[PDB]
Design an enzyme around this catalytic site. Structure first.
Site, PDB file in Angstrom:
ATOM      1  N   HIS B 201      39.504  43.329  39.827  1.00 33.76           N
ATOM      2  CA  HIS B 201      40.436  44.370  39.925  1.00 33.76           C
ATOM      3  C   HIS B 201      40.181  45.474  39.896  1.00 33.76           C
ATOM      4  O   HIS B 201      41.009  46.512  40.527  1.00 33.76           O
ATOM      5  CB  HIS B 201      41.350  43.992  38.464  1.00 33.76           C
ATOM      6  CG  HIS B 201      42.327  42.960  38.436  1.00 33.76           C
ATOM      7  ND1 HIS B 201      41.873  41.807  37.738  1.00 33.76           N
ATOM      8  CD2 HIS B 201      43.576  42.775  38.796  1.00 33.76           C
ATOM      9  CE1 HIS B 201      42.829  41.008  37.801  1.00 33.76           C
ATOM     10  NE2 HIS B 201      43.799  41.452  38.288  1.00 33.76           N
ATOM     11  N   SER B 205      41.336  43.804  46.393  1.00 35.19           N
ATOM     12  CA  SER B 205      41.110  42.180  47.211  1.00 35.19           C
ATOM     13  C   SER B 205      40.923  42.478  48.599  1.00 35.19           C
ATOM     14  O   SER B 205      41.305  43.462  49.132  1.00 35.19           O
ATOM     15  CB  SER B 205      42.606  41.558  46.827  1.00 35.19           C
ATOM     16  OG  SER B 205      42.861  41.655  45.745  1.00 35.19           O
ATOM     17  N   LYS B 227      54.831  33.322  45.154  1.00 41.00           N
ATOM     18  CA  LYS B 227      53.877  32.765  46.078  1.00 41.00           C
ATOM     19  C   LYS B 227      53.005  31.979  45.435  1.00 41.00           C
ATOM     20  O   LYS B 227      52.989  30.760  45.861  1.00 41.00           O
ATOM     21  CB  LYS B 227      53.177  33.818  46.981  1.00 41.00           C
ATOM     22  CG  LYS B 227      52.354  33.314  47.935  1.00 41.00           C
ATOM     23  CD  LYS B 227      52.701  33.476  49.347  1.00 41.00           C
ATOM     24  CE  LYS B 227      51.517  33.170  50.304  1.00 41.00           C
ATOM     25  NZ  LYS B 227      50.019  33.754  49.941  1.00 41.00           N
ATOM     26  N   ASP B 228      52.310  32.465  44.411  1.00 36.76           N
ATOM     27  CA  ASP B 228      51.303  31.415  43.837  1.00 36.76           C
ATOM     28  C   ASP B 228      52.255  30.375  42.963  1.00 36.76           C
ATOM     29  O   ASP B 228      51.628  29.471  42.905  1.00 36.76           O
ATOM     30  CB  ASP B 228      50.474  32.244  42.743  1.00 36.76           C
ATOM     31  CG  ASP B 228      49.835  33.465  43.624  1.00 36.76           C
ATOM     32  OD1 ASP B 228      50.296  33.822  44.627  1.00 36.76           O
ATOM     33  OD2 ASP B 228      48.662  33.887  43.012  1.00 36.76           O
ATOM     34  N   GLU B 271      29.894  11.538  41.098  1.00 36.99           N
ATOM     35  CA  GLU B 271      31.319  11.786  41.504  1.00 36.99           C
ATOM     36  C   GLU B 271      31.363  12.393  42.766  1.00 36.99           C
ATOM     37  O   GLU B 271      30.291  12.829  43.359  1.00 36.99           O
ATOM     38  CB  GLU B 271      32.101  12.879  40.549  1.00 36.99           C
ATOM     39  CG  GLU B 271      32.983  12.148  39.585  1.00 36.99           C
ATOM     40  CD  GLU B 271      34.248  11.663  40.176  1.00 36.99           C
ATOM     41  OE1 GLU B 271      34.218  11.477  41.509  1.00 36.99           O
ATOM     42  OE2 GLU B 271      35.460  11.590  39.724  1.00 36.99           O
TER      43      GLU B 271
HETATM   44  C1  HEM Z   1      36.393  28.754  37.813  1.00 36.27           C
HETATM   45  C2  HEM Z   1      36.905  28.777  38.777  1.00 36.27           C
HETATM   46  C3  HEM Z   1      37.334  30.263  39.342  1.00 36.27           C
HETATM   47  C4  HEM Z   1      38.568  31.070  38.994  1.00 36.27           C
HETATM   48  C5  HEM Z   1      39.439  30.612  37.896  1.00 36.27           C
HETATM   49  C6  HEM Z   1      38.442  32.037  39.893  1.00 36.27           C
HETATM   50  C7  HEM Z   1      39.606  32.921  39.793  1.00 36.27           C
HETATM   51  C8  HEM Z   1      40.012  34.015  40.754  1.00 36.27           C
HETATM   52  C9  HEM Z   1      41.031  34.501  41.019  1.00 36.27           C
HETATM   53  C10 HEM Z   1      42.427  34.201  40.321  1.00 36.27           C
HETATM   54  C11 HEM Z   1      40.896  35.268  42.184  1.00 36.27           C
HETATM   55  C12 HEM Z   1      41.824  36.132  42.651  1.00 36.27           C
HETATM   56  C13 HEM Z   1      42.721  35.266  43.429  1.00 36.27           C
HETATM   57  C14 HEM Z   1      41.941  35.283  45.132  1.00 36.27           C
HETATM   58  O1  HEM Z   1      41.433  36.375  45.604  1.00 36.27           O
HETATM   59  O2  HEM Z   1      41.596  34.320  45.522  1.00 36.27           O
HETATM   60  C15 HEM Z   1      39.381  35.223  42.427  1.00 36.27           C
HETATM   61  C16 HEM Z   1      39.025  35.920  43.519  1.00 36.27           C
HETATM   62  C17 HEM Z   1      37.666  35.844  43.986  1.00 36.27           C
HETATM   63  N1  HEM Z   1      36.732  35.086  43.474  1.00 36.27           N
HETATM   64 FE1  HEM Z   1      37.067  33.672  41.975  1.00 36.27          FE
HETATM   65  N2  HEM Z   1      37.651  32.206  40.698  1.00 36.27           N
HETATM   66  C18 HEM Z   1      36.644  31.155  40.511  1.00 36.27           C
HETATM   67  C19 HEM Z   1      35.601  30.626  41.180  1.00 36.27           C
HETATM   68  C20 HEM Z   1      34.958  31.481  42.194  1.00 36.27           C
HETATM   69  C21 HEM Z   1      33.678  30.998  42.696  1.00 36.27           C
HETATM   70  C22 HEM Z   1      32.800  29.911  42.635  1.00 36.27           C
HETATM   71  C23 HEM Z   1      33.284  32.143  43.591  1.00 36.27           C
HETATM   72  C24 HEM Z   1      32.158  32.169  44.446  1.00 36.27           C
HETATM   73  C25 HEM Z   1      30.895  32.178  43.957  1.00 36.27           C
HETATM   74  C26 HEM Z   1      34.289  33.304  43.422  1.00 36.27           C
HETATM   75  C27 HEM Z   1      34.523  34.561  43.978  1.00 36.27           C
HETATM   76  C28 HEM Z   1      35.530  35.175  44.021  1.00 36.27           C
HETATM   77  C29 HEM Z   1      35.710  36.161  45.007  1.00 36.27           C
HETATM   78  C30 HEM Z   1      34.766  36.865  46.047  1.00 36.27           C
HETATM   79  C31 HEM Z   1      37.208  36.814  44.743  1.00 36.27           C
HETATM   80  C32 HEM Z   1      37.769  37.778  45.585  1.00 36.27           C
HETATM   81  C33 HEM Z   1      38.430  37.090  46.778  1.00 36.27           C
HETATM   82  C34 HEM Z   1      39.345  38.027  47.399  1.00 36.27           C
HETATM   83  O3  HEM Z   1      40.098  38.733  46.553  1.00 36.27           O
HETATM   84  O4  HEM Z   1      39.457  38.696  48.483  1.00 36.27           O
HETATM   85  N3  HEM Z   1      35.130  32.692  42.467  1.00 36.27           N
HETATM   86  N4  HEM Z   1      38.901  34.478  41.808  1.00 36.27           N
END
Ligand code: HEM
Ligand SMILES: CCCCCCCCCCCCCCCCCC(=O)OC[C@H](COP(=O)([O-])OCC(O)COP(=O)([O-])OC[C@@H](COC(=O)CCCCCCCCCCCCCCCCC)OC(=O)CCCCCCCCCCCCCCCCC)OC(=O)CCCCCCCCCCCCCCCCC
Ligand SMILES: CCCCCCCCCCCCCCCCCC(=O)OC[C@H](COP(=O)([O-])OCC(O)COP(=O)([O-])OC[C@@H](COC(=O)CCCCCCCCCCCCCCCCC)OC(=O)CCCCCCCCCCCCCCCCC)OC(=O)CCCCCCCCCCCCCCCCC
Ligand SMILES: CCCCCCCCCCCCCCCCCC(=O)OC[C@H](COP(=O)([O-])OCC[N+](C)(C)C)OC(=O)CCCCCCCCCCCCCCCCC
Ligand SMILES: CCCCCCCCCCCCCCCCCC(=O)OC[C@H](COP(=O)(O)OCCN)OC(=O)CCCCCCCCCCCCCCCCC
Ligand SMILES: CCCCCCCCCCCCCCCCCC(=O)OC[C@H](COP(=O)(O)OCCN)OC(=O)CCCCCCCCCCCCCCCCC
Ligand SMILES: CCCCCCCCCCCCCCCCCC(=O)OC[C@H](COP(=O)(O)OCCN)OC(=O)CCCCCCCCCCCCCCCCC
Ligand SMILES: CCCCCCCCCCCCCCCCCC(=O)OC[C@H](COP(=O)(O)OCCN)OC(=O)CCCCCCCCCCCCCCCCC
Ligand code: HEM
Ligand code: HEM
Ligand code: HEM
Ligand code: FES
Lengths: 74, 379, 164, 56, 239, 52, 379, 55
Positions: B201, B205, B227-228, B271
């Site tokens: 935040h 994004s 949307k979500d 798995e």
């Molecule tokens: C436990 C699983 C995960 C949850 C619940 C989670 C949750 C979130 C959420 C809600 C967002 C904002 C929505 C979005 O931008 O798509 C986000 C953004 C992001 N997450 Fe995750 N995430 C998870 C796993 C990961 C993993 C494995 C990575 C990569 C190593 C990661 C890296 C990022 C990045 C780089 C963003 C920014 C994307 C953007 O806003 O352009 N996340 N995450």
């Protein structure tokens, strides 16, 4: 990051209409299908080839397993 | 005198984290997966608890208790298969989320990227300990193989392996500690997801174009909530189709056999969402080298913010990089399939080539290609 | 506005149906499972009890009380202090069985199990706070303010009986 | 218009909106359950227990 | 090596919204009662599960009453026999698991409570394996007491041929041909592995209709709220 | 509190919100009946009693 | 350049939490218990995990498993009795914290007070569910009695008790559900405690004098970190005394017996911390009146901010209120002593009088005393 | 068959009566409580046990 100090604009005008005045599906198929076709044309020449060669590799390996598996005349 | 939404402390946090959060106006459907994973997480917790209330983590009763859940507990089968297929959906959304982050240059967020990597590792650990609990043939033997993997580490080795085992091999004690670790871990995942959102935040994004979207931010609540919600409905559609029409589609039948340690199943595969690592395991002849490659396959995501050399954040305007990324994805599916198959002449060489390509694209092809693109575009 | 909000109303109705049929799944899961839904049909038999002998078994997770009502009580206790006895009840009102009175094994003062063959009479003496119970389950002396509730005795043919 | 009457009779107030949704769900649950069960029984006619209880 | 995968038979429940033919379930339970239960075992399912699926309550309690079951301690601690009740799981033919191997050549008969859902291939396998027995081809000699079955991995089963035409008499009166017996017992085993099959299909039908209703409406709501942004018209007027 | 809220304008506000609050309570009652599947109430409404 | 402690968002939250938080310099030792509670919570969680790694949740193998923890697991008795006595320490600190809130008028912070009441409810629920897990005679019969209390609820009582039981009595289903809820609940307690601290920080801590301490403030780090460290060491000393020297001091010996549903203990009582309410319900003859008094005994803390009538927040300058408060504390100890004692004259009369006096002090004597108090100071 | 063999170190202490109901039957009807926890299960401990045996 809250609204108010995001950026600086000047001389930008945004006209918009109420959601209750527009149709939520304006030319859904008339304009949507050409746009989807254009997007597919733009992306397919880059996305398809790796998957098609993956399919070739998968089929080749799957057939390779059997003939190594098959009986050897001896 | 002031709106409660932005004056009450908890309400203020909820407001500036989910309601009035300025988000880019053109985030595609892929961004929706960020929500879905979280929802999946809740669906994993809320359903999982209801299995813990009829599951006894004892070797003499674990499998019998699970069969009791599926045959005698009112609507228990729904909970069990919802849980299993929801874990599969969780990994699907996790992989798609990592793909989105890698594609649209999101790894410049650094802190969020590293927290995501930690979350990913924790989720794989959680699923690994989870598969053991039904105490089937595949559960037992996959646990045996994956724990015996750790014997490759020098010096400590067997001592660490038996420490995890709580004995000479997997047994009642191992099942019990796996159950307890499995119970605790998802709450750590929840806290880490909160930290992930907190770090995200501060900067906003990444929109698909990759340019800063401070000139097109929109309030979150009117648009992205619905949307979500649509995204979550689609994910529920897929998950419910899987549960109610082919519950064991992504599942080995042999797990429906009580774990007999005196019989090795003809096939020993983890798995479906672990095979890409396991195939890499099969590629390296050396055991220590195999384990190092297995961990490096997932650890390589940390190097990504250092390996990006193109002067464009996103990949939307970069064709050759796009082709390389799709080749990487195809290589990932190839690794999954290879890990699924046994280890014979047709598959060994394919696995070696797939592993080499998987590392080469990330570490070599992508940066050099980015240099080529920068040169080609007069910068 | 009516059309636009009708879309929302139909959406909300569908979501309400889905939410009910989802939460009910979990709630019914937290109810009694099918295996414990095989209860209240215990096939115990009365051919192990003469007057005074007082077996007690398990049923619905609680003790039940199988006792041959003594040759005394059937004739006297049916009219021993029928006025109040801290609770009004007649012997065959308790059970239609005139020789095989059965009860539940929860003493009706606080929640306990009265041990059999004890008391000033000797039917059921509650170990907790005294409160002896008559051999047919009646209460005369003791902090207990009520008699044992008698489970629905679906007595089958011959010795075999059903409680509940 | 029928839609306009429905709106400014039973949709304007959010509390009336909630009451409408509640009663609509009350009737919709019964209607949908009846319809889906009837369809499912029609597809598998003669293959369910309820279709063969009469024999035994 | 090599193994022969079972062909995809056209099962009655193969359909996306199809249900197990419960009459065939009753016949398959008969088959298990007088054929498979002699040496094979089924534990996780009980007579109670039979009601409302293939047998009525009276028939189920009669079926339970037929068998004799060991009970708890007697008035002095003895192991007294007892007529089985509806809440009794299906009796195990051999008391200890090793005794099953000892009575047989040495391979214990696997429990059928999950054999459909545990064997790769499903009913098509379990069906075909029964109706797949044949004389061994030339050049491969089988041990004494072993039997050749192409579908069984290793091509060497320890089964005496279990199902042959005119083995049992169905209560209904359908012909007892070996294929019919195999099909009905296979359907019963599928029910044993997945008791909730019919309910799962019913709920799947409900889910399909409910999502086909909700998804267009929620998409319409999304389009409604986003139409403010999907129809905006920008303008730039620098001085 | 015991007298500050006891006023003619406050009483009028109560009258203004009586329909809204009362039929919100009706909303809650009907929702509770529907959710719990209260037979004692649902046995009287036609076409819904057929469910039982 | 920015200081990482004051710029990194995670370190920023930690800094504002307990590094540079302005705290009054004159807070007495009675505030340390707050930290102790958190410390106890953390300790509890750790021990809980190491107990959940060797404890089956089946009626057949519950009690024996616990013995296997004490008799077989290397250093297992220490973990088990550490949990058992840390529960008592947790409740000692909880009661002292509630007393501190009552005394120095800290309940004037309304949101923190209500959140604390919710935390109290959750803590008693968690401890009750935990006591059932060893499946001793006391656990079984106490669970039976407590859940049978819910049958007094009108209309929906019997259904509710059967539902919670997962059957018709306390059995395998109830034990497994209790294990699952005992596992999950402390994490909810942790989240609620974080919310508690959040609400507290927006107003700052209250000093013993009651007067705002804005002029005299000190950083939390150099002083209160070490002060709470000393408090934690003293609490560790007491808890370790209990664990190492008299592990079953605050424990009924009847718990060391397999839960036999055909034989009640001669005396049935809860743990000590539950007696103060238990005796209260013993006072009321009516079954539903007992439940209502039970819930009121704790919910009456909600009315504390409203019942306050003295012009001064604290109680350092209100001698009559001080005698009233110590009368209330002595009455609470009276109820605790009575609850363990069997119901019999004179304990019936003394318990009824104690409950009546408790409610009289809480609702009547304290506000009347405060009103009399104000007149004596010309206000 | 459930054969016979000398006990080893890992084996637990012998149990004389097969089932607890047999234990009740062998005596007047009471159950001899397990001694593995008697001291710390009865109010009084070793004092109570000594008094019971010798008193
Ligand atoms: C436990 C699983 C995960 C949850 C619940 C989670 C949750 C979130 C959420 C809600 C967002 C904002 C929505 C979005 O931008 O798509 C986000 C953004 C992001 N997450 Fe995750 N995430 C998870 C796993 C990961 C993993 C494995 C990575 C990569 C190593 C990661 C890296 C990022 C990045 C780089 C963003 C920014 C994307 C953007 O806003 O352009 N996340 N995450
Ligand atoms: C896997 C996990 C589970 C799934 C996760 C889903 C996450 C995303 C959820 C939200 C979402 O779908 O966002 C993408 C996207 C967001 O844009 P949109 O609201 O469709 O508006 C059109 C776009 O502006 C784009 O408009 P356009 O230029 O393509 O032309 C207009 C329109 C017309 O074209 C079409 O509709 C495509 C042809 C089929 C008709 O295009 C679309 O509707 C494209 C989507 C396909 C339908 O929506 C969809 O893809 C629609 C989903 C399918 C329709 C609802 C179900 C029936
Ligand atoms: C007609 C020939 C086939 C066309 C579709 C296949 C294809 O390669 O299209 C590429 C073509 C060009 O890609 P693009 O729109 O430039 O890039 C994708 C958008 O950035 C991001 O996607 P979007 O937001 O523009 O459109 C969302 C799209 C696809 O949504 C997603 O891909 C994300 C969620 C679904 C994941 C995959 C589920 C299967 O939705 C659907 O296709 C229908 C509903 C699917 C579930 C809800 C979403 O895109 C489409 O035709 C629609 C999106 C991809 C559909 C697959
Ligand atoms: C309080 C609201 C009504 C709850 C209730 O019992 O509804 C009736 C329904 C079904 O009951 P019913 O409508 O068949 O009749 C009432 C039956 N007794 C009296 C036993 C409750 O209740 C339930 O389904 C669950 C009850 C507990 C809900 C909390
Ligand atoms: C199969 C892939 C999914 C179906 C849709 C086809 C597709 O992905 O097309 C590529 C799409 C192209 O559009 P865009 O993101 O704007 O990229 C530049 C276009 N000139 O670009 C994208 O869709 C990029 C999405 C990247 C993340 C999701 C895909 C990878 C998942 C890995 C697991
Ligand atoms: C938990 C609460 C305590 C930790 C968080 C609050 C303290 C600050 C962060 C941790 C720390 O001690 O960092 C030391 C150092 C900071 O950087 P430095 O250049 O020394 O100072 C200016 C920027 N703060 O950062 C460093 O990395 C110093 C070098 C490594 C340690 C030697
Ligand atoms: C304990 C015995 C010591 C004690 O508490 O002495 C009283 C003392 C008073 O301290 P102070 O407020 O400075 O006195 C001003 C006098 N003009 O100190 C106090 O009054 C502080 C102790 C009372 C408030 C802190 C919480 C503990 C209360 C007793 C146990 C609470 C739990 C049980 C009751 C609820
Ligand atoms: C709170 C939930 C428990 C209420 C207390 C109780 O006794 O509930 C009884 C019953 C539980 O389920 P039961 O009917 O026993 O299941 C039979 C086997 N399927 O209760 C029920 O079956 C339903 C109880 C009502 C709560 C669940 C249904 C409504 C959920 C919200 C819908 C709207 C959102
Ligand atoms: C991070 C999210 C989670 C994942 C990915 C996950 C994964 C899994 C998997 C793959 C299984 C095996 C299911 C099967 O083979 O049938 C499983 C079983 C189980 N999980 Fe989880 N789980 C998660 C969260 C939880 C939580 C939060 C709990 C506790 C509340 C839990 C408790 C269980 C239990 C008790 C089982 C055994 C039930 C069974 O036999 O399926 N899980 N989990
Ligand atoms: C889960 C157990 C609890 C934890 C971990 C906890 C944590 C804390 C901590 C660390 C503090 C600051 C230090 C202090 O002033 O004591 C605090 C303050 C406070 N807590 Fe709690 N608390 C708990 C339970 C309660 C309960 C049961 C109440 C009463 C209902 C309560 C009410 C308060 C109040 C009023 C304060 C402010 C005291 C002051 O400012 O002087 N808390 N809490
Ligand atoms: C809020 C903090 C906690 C409290 C107050 C608490 C309280 C208790 C109590 C009083 C017992 C009974 C001990 C006995 O009778 O010997 C117990 C047992 C147990 N608790 Fe907890 N507990 C807490 C946290 C946890 C957590 C987080 C876990 C899981 C990780 C856990 C797992 C267990 C287990 C497995 C037992 C059974 C072992 C035993 O009874 O000795 N507890 N708990
Ligand atoms: S419970 Fe038997 S007398 Fe109190």
């Amino acid at each position: 990051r809250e609204f108010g100090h995001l950026t600086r604009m000047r001389h930008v005008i945004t006209y918009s209409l109420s959601p209750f005045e527009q149709r939520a599906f304006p030319h859904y198929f008339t304009k949507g299908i050409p746009n989807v076709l254009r997007r597919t044309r733009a992306c397919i020449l880059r996305v398809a080839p790796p998957f098609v060669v993956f399919y070739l590799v998968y089929t080749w390996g799957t057939q390779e397993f059997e003939k190594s598996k098959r009986k050897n005349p001896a | 005198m002031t709106n409660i939404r932005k004056s009450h402390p908890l309400m203020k946090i909820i407001n500036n984290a989910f309601i009035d959060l300025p988000a880019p106006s053109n985030i595609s459907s892929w961004w929706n997966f960020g929500s879905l994973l979280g929802i999946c997480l809740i669906l994993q917790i809320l359903t999982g608890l209801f299995l813990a209330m009829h599951y006894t983590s004892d070797t003499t009763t674990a499998f019998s208790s699970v069969t009791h859940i599926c045959r005698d507990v009112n609507y228990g089968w729904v909970i069990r298969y919802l849980h299993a297929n929801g874990a599969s959906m969780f990994f699907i959304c996790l992989f798609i989320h990592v793909g989105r982050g890698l594609y649209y240059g999101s790894y410049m967020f650094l802190e969020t990227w590293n927290i995501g990597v930690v979350l990913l590792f924790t989720v794989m650990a959680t699923a690994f300990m989870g598969y053991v609990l039904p105490w089937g043939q595949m559960s037992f033997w996959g646990a045996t193989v994956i724990t015996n993997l750790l014997s490759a580490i020098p010096y400590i080795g067997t001592d660490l392996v038996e420490w995890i085992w709580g004995g000479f091999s997997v047994d009642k004690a191992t099942l019990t500690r796996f159950f307890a670790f499995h119970f605790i871990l998802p709450f750590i995942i929840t806290a880490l997801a909160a930290v992930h959102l907190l770090f995200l935040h501060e900067t906003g994004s990444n929109n698909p174009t990759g340019i800063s979207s401070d000139m097109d931010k929109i309030p979150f609540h009117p648009y992205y909530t619905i949307k979500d919600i649509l995204g979550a409905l689609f994910m529920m559609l897929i998950l419910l189709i899987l549960v109610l029409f082919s519950p064991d589609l992504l599942g080995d039948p042999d797990n429906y056999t009580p774990a007999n340690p005196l019989n090795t199943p003809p096939h020993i595969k983890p798995e479906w969402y672990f095979l890409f690592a396991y195939a890499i395991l099969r590629s390296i002849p050396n055991k220590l080298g195999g384990v190092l490659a297995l961990v490096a396959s997932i650890l390589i995501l940390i190097l990504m913010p250092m390996l990006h050399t193109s002067k464009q954040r996103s990949m939307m305007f970069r064709p050759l990089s796009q082709c390389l990324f799709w080749m990487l994805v195809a290589d990932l599916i190839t690794l999954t399939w290879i890990g699924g198959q046994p280890v014979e002449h047709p598959f060994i060489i394919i696995g070696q080539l797939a592993s080499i390509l998987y590392f080469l694209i990330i570490l070599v092809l992508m940066p050099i290609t980015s240099i080529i693109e920068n040169n080609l575009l007069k910068w | 506005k009516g059309f636009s909000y009708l879309i929302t109303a139909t959406t909300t109705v569908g979501v309400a149906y889905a939410a009910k049929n989802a939460v009910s799944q979990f709630v019914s899961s937290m109810s009694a499972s099918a295996d414990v839904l095989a209860m209240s049909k215990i096939e115990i038999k009365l051919s192990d009890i003469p007057e005074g002998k007082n077996m007690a078994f398990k049923w619905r997770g609680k003790p039940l009380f199988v006792r041959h009502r003594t040759k005394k009580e059937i004739d006297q206790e049916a009219a021993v202090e029928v006025s109040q006895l801290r609770d009004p009840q007649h012997d065959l009102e308790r059970v239609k069985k005139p020789e095989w009175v059965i009860l539940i094994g929860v003493c009706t003062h606080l929640g306990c199990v009265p041990i059999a063959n004890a008391g000033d009479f000797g039917g059921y003496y509650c170990p907790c706070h005294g409160s002896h119970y008559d051999a047919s389950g009646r209460i005369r002396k003791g902090p207990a303010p009520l008699n044992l509730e008698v489970p629905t005795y679906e007595f089958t043919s011959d010795d075999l009986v059903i409680v509940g | 218009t029928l839609t306009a009457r429905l709106y400014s009779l039973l949709f304007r107030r959010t509390s009336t909106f909630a009451l409408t949704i509640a009663v609509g769900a009350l009737f919709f649950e019964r209607a949908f359950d009846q319809g889906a069960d009837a369809i499912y029984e029609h597809i598998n006619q003669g293959k369910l227990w309820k279709h063969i209880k009469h024999k035994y | 090596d090599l193994e022969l995968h079972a062909p995809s038979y056209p099962w009655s429940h193969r359909g996306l919204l199809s249900s197990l033919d419960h009459t065939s379930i009753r016949r398959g339970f008969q088959v298990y009662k007088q054929v498979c239960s002699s040496c094979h075992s089924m534990d996780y399912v009980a007579y109670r599960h039979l009601v409302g699926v293939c047998y009525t309550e009276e028939e189920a309690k009669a079926l339970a009453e037929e068998v004799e079951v060991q009970d708890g301690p007697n008035e002095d601690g003895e192991m007294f026999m007892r007529p089985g009740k509806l809440s009794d799981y299906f009796p195990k033919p051999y008391p200890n698991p090793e005794a099953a191997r000892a009575a047989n050549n040495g391979a214990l008969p696997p429990d059928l409570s999950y054999i459909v859902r545990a064997r790769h291939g499903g009913e098509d396998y379990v069906f075909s394996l029964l109706t797949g027995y044949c004389e061994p081809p030339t050049g491969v000699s089988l041990r004494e007491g072993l039997y050749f079955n192409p579908y069984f991995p290793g091509q060497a089963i320890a089964m005496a041929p279990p199902i042959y035409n005119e083995v049992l008499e169905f209560d209904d009166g359908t012909p007892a041909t070996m294929s019919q017996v195999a099909k009905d017992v296979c359907t019963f085993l599928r029910w044993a592995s997945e008791p909730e099959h019919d309910h799962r299909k019913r709920m799947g039908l409900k889910m399909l209709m409910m999502m086909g209703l909700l998804l267009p409406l929620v998409y319409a709501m999304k389009r409604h709220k986003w139409s403010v942004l999907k129809s905006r018209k920008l303008a730039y007027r620098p001085p | 509190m015991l007298s500050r809220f006891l006023g003619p304008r406050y009483r009028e506000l109560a009258r203004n919100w009586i329909p809204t609050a009362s039929m919100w309570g009706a909303v809650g009652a009907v929702g509770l009946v529907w959710a719990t599947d209260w037979r004692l109430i649902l046995d009287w409404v036609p076409y819904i009693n057929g469910k039982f």
